[PDB]
Amino acid sequence: KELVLALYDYQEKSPREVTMKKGDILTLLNSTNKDWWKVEVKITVNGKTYERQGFVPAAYVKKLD
Ligand SMILES: [Cl-]
Ligand SMILES: [Cl-]
């Protein structure tokens, strides 16, 4: 899929948002809302990869693709 770069830190404002740190690279899922983009974060637990999706401000991310 498409990637985006975190321009600035962002603290999630609800469970439906994701927290970013400046310099993070995330997957872009949906950018059709002008203000809020749905992105995807990955974690690993015991060597297995899980994913969580949620909104961040479109202005806080830059498309890399
Ligand atoms: Cl920052
Ligand atoms: Cl962009």
Short mmCIF file of N, CA and C in Angstrom, two decimals, residues 5-59:
data_model
loop_
_atom_site.label_atom_id
_atom_site.label_comp_id
_atom_site.label_asym_id
_atom_site.label_seq_id
_atom_site.Cartn_x
_atom_site.Cartn_y
_atom_site.Cartn_z
N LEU A 5 4.79 9.69 6.01
CA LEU A 5 5.74 10.06 7.04
C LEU A 5 5.05 10.96 8.09
N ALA A 6 5.27 10.68 9.38
CA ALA A 6 4.77 11.52 10.45
C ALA A 6 5.55 12.85 10.49
N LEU A 7 4.89 13.96 10.19
CA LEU A 7 5.61 15.26 10.24
C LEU A 7 5.88 15.72 11.66
N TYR A 8 4.95 15.45 12.58
CA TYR A 8 5.01 15.88 13.98
C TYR A 8 4.45 14.77 14.86
N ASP A 9 4.76 14.81 16.16
CA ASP A 9 4.10 13.94 17.13
C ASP A 9 2.62 14.24 17.12
N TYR A 10 1.84 13.24 17.47
CA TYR A 10 0.40 13.42 17.65
C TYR A 10 -0.10 12.45 18.72
N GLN A 11 -0.74 12.98 19.78
CA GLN A 11 -1.35 12.17 20.83
C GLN A 11 -2.79 11.84 20.44
N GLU A 12 -3.17 10.56 20.46
CA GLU A 12 -4.51 10.23 20.03
C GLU A 12 -5.52 10.90 20.96
N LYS A 13 -6.61 11.37 20.37
CA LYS A 13 -7.66 12.05 21.20
C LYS A 13 -8.82 11.16 21.61
N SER A 14 -8.80 9.92 21.11
CA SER A 14 -9.80 8.93 21.45
C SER A 14 -9.21 7.60 20.96
N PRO A 15 -9.82 6.47 21.37
CA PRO A 15 -9.44 5.15 20.91
C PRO A 15 -9.54 5.02 19.39
N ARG A 16 -10.22 5.94 18.70
CA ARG A 16 -10.36 5.81 17.23
C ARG A 16 -9.24 6.50 16.46
N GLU A 17 -8.25 6.98 17.20
CA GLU A 17 -7.13 7.71 16.60
C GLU A 17 -5.88 6.95 16.93
N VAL A 18 -4.80 7.22 16.21
CA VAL A 18 -3.51 6.61 16.54
C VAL A 18 -2.52 7.68 16.95
N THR A 19 -1.60 7.31 17.83
CA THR A 19 -0.56 8.20 18.32
C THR A 19 0.63 7.99 17.43
N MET A 20 1.25 9.09 17.00
CA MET A 20 2.44 9.09 16.15
C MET A 20 3.56 9.81 16.86
N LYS A 21 4.77 9.47 16.45
CA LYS A 21 5.94 10.20 16.83
C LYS A 21 6.56 10.74 15.53
N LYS A 22 7.06 11.96 15.58
CA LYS A 22 7.73 12.55 14.41
C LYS A 22 8.75 11.55 13.83
N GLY A 23 8.65 11.27 12.53
CA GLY A 23 9.61 10.42 11.85
C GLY A 23 9.06 9.02 11.67
N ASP A 24 7.96 8.70 12.36
CA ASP A 24 7.32 7.40 12.15
C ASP A 24 6.89 7.27 10.69
N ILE A 25 7.01 6.06 10.13
CA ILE A 25 6.44 5.75 8.82
C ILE A 25 5.22 4.82 9.05
N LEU A 26 4.04 5.19 8.54
CA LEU A 26 2.82 4.43 8.74
C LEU A 26 2.23 4.06 7.40
N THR A 27 1.27 3.13 7.37
CA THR A 27 0.56 2.77 6.14
C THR A 27 -0.68 3.68 6.01
N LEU A 28 -0.93 4.21 4.82
CA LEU A 28 -2.10 5.01 4.58
C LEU A 28 -3.22 4.12 4.09
N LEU A 29 -4.34 4.16 4.81
CA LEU A 29 -5.48 3.34 4.45
C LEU A 29 -6.50 4.16 3.70
N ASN A 30 -6.75 5.39 4.16
CA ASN A 30 -7.82 6.19 3.58
C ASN A 30 -7.51 7.64 3.79
N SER A 31 -7.52 8.37 2.68
CA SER A 31 -7.25 9.81 2.67
C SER A 31 -8.36 10.63 2.00
N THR A 32 -9.58 10.09 1.97
CA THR A 32 -10.70 10.79 1.30
C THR A 32 -11.34 11.94 2.12
N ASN A 33 -11.23 11.91 3.47
CA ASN A 33 -11.63 13.05 4.33
C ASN A 33 -10.48 14.08 4.26
N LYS A 34 -10.81 15.37 4.10
CA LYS A 34 -9.77 16.38 3.87
C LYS A 34 -8.92 16.64 5.11
N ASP A 35 -9.51 16.44 6.28
CA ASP A 35 -8.86 16.82 7.52
C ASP A 35 -8.21 15.68 8.29
N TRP A 36 -8.80 14.49 8.18
CA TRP A 36 -8.39 13.32 8.97
C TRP A 36 -8.12 12.11 8.07
N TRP A 37 -6.91 11.56 8.16
CA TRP A 37 -6.61 10.38 7.36
C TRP A 37 -6.56 9.15 8.24
N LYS A 38 -7.09 8.03 7.73
CA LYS A 38 -6.99 6.72 8.39
C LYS A 38 -5.68 6.02 8.01
N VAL A 39 -4.89 5.73 9.04
CA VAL A 39 -3.60 5.14 8.92
C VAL A 39 -3.56 3.88 9.77
N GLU A 40 -2.48 3.13 9.59
CA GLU A 40 -2.35 1.81 10.20
C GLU A 40 -1.00 1.70 10.89
N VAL A 41 -1.02 1.26 12.15
CA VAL A 41 0.20 1.05 12.95
C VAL A 41 0.39 -0.46 13.18
N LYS A 42 1.65 -0.86 13.29
CA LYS A 42 2.03 -2.24 13.50
C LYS A 42 2.72 -2.35 14.84
N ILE A 43 2.53 -3.51 15.43
CA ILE A 43 3.19 -3.89 16.65
C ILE A 43 3.63 -5.35 16.44
N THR A 44 4.62 -5.81 17.20
CA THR A 44 4.86 -7.24 17.30
C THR A 44 4.76 -7.72 18.75
N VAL A 45 4.18 -8.91 18.92
CA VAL A 45 4.11 -9.53 20.23
C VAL A 45 4.46 -10.98 20.00
N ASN A 46 5.46 -11.42 20.75
CA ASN A 46 6.01 -12.74 20.61
C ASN A 46 6.39 -13.08 19.17
N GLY A 47 6.95 -12.13 18.44
CA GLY A 47 7.33 -12.33 17.04
C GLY A 47 6.22 -12.32 15.99
N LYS A 48 4.99 -12.05 16.41
CA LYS A 48 3.85 -12.00 15.50
C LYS A 48 3.44 -10.55 15.30
N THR A 49 3.04 -10.19 14.09
CA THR A 49 2.76 -8.78 13.74
C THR A 49 1.26 -8.50 13.76
N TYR A 50 0.89 -7.48 14.54
CA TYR A 50 -0.51 -7.08 14.62
C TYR A 50 -0.58 -5.62 14.13
N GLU A 51 -1.80 -5.20 13.83
CA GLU A 51 -2.06 -3.93 13.20
C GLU A 51 -3.24 -3.24 13.92
N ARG A 52 -3.22 -1.91 13.94
CA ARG A 52 -4.32 -1.11 14.52
C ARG A 52 -4.49 0.06 13.57
N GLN A 53 -5.74 0.45 13.32
CA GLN A 53 -6.01 1.49 12.36
C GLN A 53 -6.70 2.63 13.08
N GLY A 54 -6.52 3.85 12.58
CA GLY A 54 -7.21 4.97 13.20
C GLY A 54 -6.82 6.26 12.53
N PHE A 55 -7.47 7.34 12.94
CA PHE A 55 -7.30 8.65 12.30
C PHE A 55 -6.21 9.49 12.90
N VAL A 56 -5.51 10.23 12.02
CA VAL A 56 -4.59 11.32 12.38
C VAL A 56 -4.86 12.50 11.45
N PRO A 57 -4.42 13.70 11.86
CA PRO A 57 -4.70 14.88 11.05
C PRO A 57 -3.91 14.76 9.76
N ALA A 58 -4.57 14.98 8.63
CA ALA A 58 -3.95 14.89 7.33
C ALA A 58 -2.71 15.79 7.20
N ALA A 59 -2.74 16.92 7.90
CA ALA A 59 -1.67 17.91 7.83
C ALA A 59 -0.46 17.46 8.62
#
